[PDB]
Amino acid sequence: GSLTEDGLSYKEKFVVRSYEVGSNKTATVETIANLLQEVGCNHAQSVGFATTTTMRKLHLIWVTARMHIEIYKYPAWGDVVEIETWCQSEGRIGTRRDWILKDSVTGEVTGRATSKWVMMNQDTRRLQKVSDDVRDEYLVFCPQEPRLAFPEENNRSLKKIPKLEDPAQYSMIGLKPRRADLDMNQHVNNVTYIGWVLESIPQEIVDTHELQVITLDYRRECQQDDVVDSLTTTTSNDSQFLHLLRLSGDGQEINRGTTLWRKK
Amino acid sequence: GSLTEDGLSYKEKFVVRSYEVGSNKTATVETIANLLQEVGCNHAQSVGFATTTTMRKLHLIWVTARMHIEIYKYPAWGDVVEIETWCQSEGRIGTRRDWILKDSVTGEVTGRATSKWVMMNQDTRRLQKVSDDVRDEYLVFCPQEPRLAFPEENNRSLKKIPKLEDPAQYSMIGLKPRRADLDMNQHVNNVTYIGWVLESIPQEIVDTHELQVITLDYRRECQQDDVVDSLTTTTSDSQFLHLLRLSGDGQEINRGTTLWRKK
Numbered sequence: 463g464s465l466t467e468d469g470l471s472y473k474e475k476f477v478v479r480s481y482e483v484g485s486n487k488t489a490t491v492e493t494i495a496n497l498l499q500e501v502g503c504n505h506a507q508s509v510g511f512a513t514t515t516t517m518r519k520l521h522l523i524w525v526t527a528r529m530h531i532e533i534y535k536y537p538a539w540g541d542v543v544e545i546e547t548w549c550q551s552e553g554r555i556g557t558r559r560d561w562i563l564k565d566s567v568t569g570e571v572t573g574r575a576t577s578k579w580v581m582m583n584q585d586t587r588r589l590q591k592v593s594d595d596v597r598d599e600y601l602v603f604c605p606q607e608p609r610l611a612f613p614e615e616n617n618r619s620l621k622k623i624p625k626l627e628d629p630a631q632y633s634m635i636g637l638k639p640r641r642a643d644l645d646m647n648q649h650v651n652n653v654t655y656i657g658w659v660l661e662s663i664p665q666e667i668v669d670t671h672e673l674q675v676i677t678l679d680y681r682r683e684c685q686q687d688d689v690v691d692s693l694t695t696t697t698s699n700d701s702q703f704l705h706l707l708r709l710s711g712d713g714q715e716i717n718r719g720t721t722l723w724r725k726k
Numbered sequence: 727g728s729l730t731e732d733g734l735s736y737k738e739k740f741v742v743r744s745y746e747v748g749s750n751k752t753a754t755v756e757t758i759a760n761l762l763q764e765v766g767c768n769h770a771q772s773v774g775f776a777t778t779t780t781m782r783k784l785h786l787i788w789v790t791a792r793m794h795i796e797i798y799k800y801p802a803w804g805d806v807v808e809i810e811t812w813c814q815s816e817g818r819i820g821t822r823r824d825w826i827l828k829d830s831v832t833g834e835v836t837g838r839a840t841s842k843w844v845m846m847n848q849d850t851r852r853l854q855k856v857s858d859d860v861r862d863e864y865l866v867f868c869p870q871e872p873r874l875a876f877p878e879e880n881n882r883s884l885k886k887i888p889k890l891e892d893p894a895q896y897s898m899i900g901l902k903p904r905r906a907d908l909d910m911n912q913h914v915n916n917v918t919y920i921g922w923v924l925e926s927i928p929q930e931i932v933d934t935h936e937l938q939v940i941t942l943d944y945r946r947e948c949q950q951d952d953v954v955d956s957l958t959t960t961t962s963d964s965q966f967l968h969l970l971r972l973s974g975d976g977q978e979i980n981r982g983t984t985l986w987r988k989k
């Protein structure tokens with residue numbers, strides 16, 4: 463991978479692996495999400511980082527608030543997918559990281575994604591608006607003119623997501639993370655929550671449809687000793703679902719999301 | 727990746743990814759096992775396959791009977807690891823696939839693995855041993871002189887593994903596969919069983935030791951609707967005996983052993 467000529471974005475190519483594909487012999491949305499996190503990490507490494515020197519002093523970290531992914535074509539096993547990523551400040555609210563996925567052979571856009579990140583104290587878990595001196599540190603690595611992966615006016619990435627009401631139409635109960643689900647800091651990987659959301663989609667949908675859009679809000683993290691229930695209800699040639707992840711015991715919400723599926 | 731000059735082995739380099747590493751900022755043994763399966767699949771693809779034309783007609787597939795991995799140094803995030811793999815027939819018992827892992831910068835051997843595979847009818851799940859001109863079809867892609875990743879006599883990869891007796895010292899119960907645990911044919915990925923074995927290792931060991939050797943026997947598959955219990959007992963460096971069995975009736979699916987070195 464490498465930073466582009468202007469040094470304001472990063473590009474990396476990936477050959478899709480045999481264990482990264484589903485029954486269609488194309489990459490799963492969890493494989494795609496892992497590749498988005500990998501190119502994000504390589505971009506941060508290329509510019510000297512994911513936290514600045516001032517953030518580490520204050521015990522501040524970046525935390526995902528929302529992930530939105532839209533895929534037009536999933537790459538098949540052995541295909542090469544090129545991914546371009548960049549970051550942009552959204553005032554004191556936080557930062558946005560965007561991605562564009564392309565077929566390396568045709569140059570056509572096969573997918574896009576956007577994510578919202580907020581600053582949080584790693585110890586107290588308290589959120590805060592971005593300060594000026596901390597913001598100044600990373601403004602030099604972001605484009606100044608707006609560059610959006612989702613430029614549309616009433617686009618799906620900014621829609622409010624409602625809370626699923628019981629009874630759910632479908633459910634997958636007692637989901638727990640294993641060591642492979644943890645990152646290098648022993649926290650549950652953000653992609654694991656995507657997998658857990660999809661656990662409650664009926665097999666019939668997975669067999670007849672392809673996942674086109676997924677939007678996921680992150681409210682609270684699942685700890686290594688927590689147990690999760692994944693709930694889904696149909697809200698709709700296209701099928702739409704409302705999703706809720708909550709702790710198995712008291713029902714505390716950890717995530718909410720929506721998916722859009724198109725007939726194969 | 728590419729076949730070597732003689733066309734009897736395959737080599738591929740991998741840059742270790744951020745999500746592939748554990749607390750130590752080095753690749754997990756499950757990341758290593760996925761890379762071994764990937765280089766195995768690319769080797770099969772490079773020679774025209776991983777079933778032969780006659781195996782597809784007879785509805786026969788290759789199934790793992792045993793996996794043995796020994797790691798001296800786990801590659802850190804961003805490091806490049808080179809892996810060489812080859813296959814060899816073992817009479818009509820089955821075939822063996824071996825691997826050698828190396829640090830791409832120093833050229834030093836950082837790990838090695840061996841696996842035993844048997845032929846099985848995909849529908850009846852019966853072991854039809856390698857017969858007729860089925861053998862002849864893949865003998866041309868294997869070296870004829872023996873080439874072993876574990877040449878030593880009476881080595882760890884050939885040791886018989888006993889059955890853990892209740893009560894186990896440690897356990898992790900109610901383990902179930904999710905869609906990410908399945909392969910392209912909707913079967914549980916062989917690496918998932920390695921993860922499940924390790925679920926019952928106490929956190930204290932994971933924090934103070936590094937995994938050096940793992941040997942795992944595969945007896946029966948976990949189906950998508952099955953629930954598994956992972957059991958572990960210390961037999962000792964620290965050594966453990968492992969057992970994976972179905973949550974309900976206790977039917978054995980895997981047995982194994984691990985050897986851990988103080989950090």
Ligand SMILES: OCn1cnc2ccccc21
Nearest residue numbers: 484490491660673905906
């Ligand atoms: O592999 C799980 N899975 C379930 N629904 C999916 C849709 C797209 C990709 C992967 C999916």
Ligand SMILES: OCn1cnc2ccccc21
Nearest residue numbers: 505506509512549600603
């Ligand atoms: O990972 C933090 N981060 C925030 N803005 C960025 C811009 C480029 C690379 C990393 C960046």
Ligand SMILES: OCn1cnc2ccccc21
Nearest residue numbers: 641642748754755924937
């Ligand atoms: O993160 C998985 N995992 C658990 N115990 C391990 C020991 C070695 C490598 C990876 C391991």
Ligand SMILES: OCn1cnc2ccccc21
Nearest residue numbers: 769770773776813864867
């Ligand atoms: O999995 C198929 N297979 C059996 N013997 C082989 C030798 C080389 C490549 C693939 C081989």
